[PDB]
Design a protein around this ligand. Structure first.
Ligand SMILES: NC(=O)c1ccc[n+]([C@@H]2O[C@H](COP(=O)([O-])OP(=O)(O)OC[C@H]3O[C@@H](n4cnc5c(N)ncnc54)[C@H](O)[C@@H]3O)[C@@H](O)[C@H]2O)c1
Length: 238
């Protein structure tokens, strides 16, 4: 897949799926910018911008600065996110608040600062990383799952608001990804009503990034408001 000369922004580019996706876009020929709280590696094969996606003021300021000098923003990938686990009645006030500020507020702030640009240029692609936990309830992850369901609903409504402008807006919802507990995930936990993984393996970040590239590409030129679950079948299609 080819992205030569296209401007691509990826949040959460510091590691995990965000890094793998920013890298895949580089290897597809794009001009990439990764945004993240921290870039603790010694080097990155793309340009980097310190950014707390939950700080609405910092997002405004960075997006304004960068949009001053780019003609066109071909692809925005929302991949920043955190996981805070706990039973619903034991989750701390702080874990609830930052779960939502980061996992939903982050994309909301990016949308508030970039939608005008997508409207102006009359096209582009957005891809937002949700989670399998937005598709199915997960013991221990009520807050995380709900924050990713909010994210999914947000990105689909944004996609409907920008469809008039020719923008495609989609999601990828990863299951367990590598970022003997692995063989027990694959088998499943019947006791917590969490199915194993029929494909008999967990995901590699590249397999999430590859799906994001497809959805951001012109091969997906008629695909909008879709959410591809990448999880070896663990949710059984739900
Ligand atoms: N790993 C899995 O199995 C899995 C499953 C479902 C969903 N996901 C989702 O995939 C995406 C990437 O997750 P990962 O597994 O690569 O996680 P990770 O923790 O390895 O990396 C996520 C990155 O997000 C960045 N980030 C966190 N808070 C931020 C903030 N406020 N502002 C800017 N950047 C911030 C972190 O600094 C980190 O670099 C996330 O959206 C995550 O929720 C992952």
């Amino acid at each position: 897949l080819d992205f030569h000369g296209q401007t691509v922004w990826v949040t959460g580019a510091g590691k995990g799926i965000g890094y793998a996706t920013a890298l895949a876009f580089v290897e597809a020929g794009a001009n990439v910018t990764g945004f993240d709280l921290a870039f603790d590696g010694e080097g990155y094969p793309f340009a980097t911008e310190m950014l707390d996606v939950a700080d609405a003021d910092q997002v405004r300021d960075v997006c304004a600065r960068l949009l001053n000098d780019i003609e066109r923003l071909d692809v925005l990938v929302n991949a920043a996110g955190i996981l805070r686990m706990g039973a619903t009645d034991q989750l701390s006030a702080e874990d609830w608040q930052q779960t939502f500020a980061v996992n939903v507020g982050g994309a909301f702030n990016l949308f508030q600062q970039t939608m005008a640009q997508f409207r102006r240029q009359r096209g582009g692609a957005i891809v937002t990383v949700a989670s399998d936990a937005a598709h199915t309830p997960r013991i221990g992850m009520s807050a995380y799952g709900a924050s990713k369901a909010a994210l999914k609903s947000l990105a689909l409504t944004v996609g409907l608001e920008l469809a008039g402008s020719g923008v495609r807006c989609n999601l990828v919802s990863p299951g367990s990804t590598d970022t003997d507990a692995e063989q027990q995930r694959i088998r499943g936990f019947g006791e917590q009503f969490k199915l194993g993984i029929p494909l008999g393996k967990i995901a590699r970040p590249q397999e999430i990034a590859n799906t994001i590239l497809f959805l951001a590409s012109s091969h997906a030129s008629h695909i909008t408001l879709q959410d591809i679950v990448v999880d070896g079948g663990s949710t059984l299609g739900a």
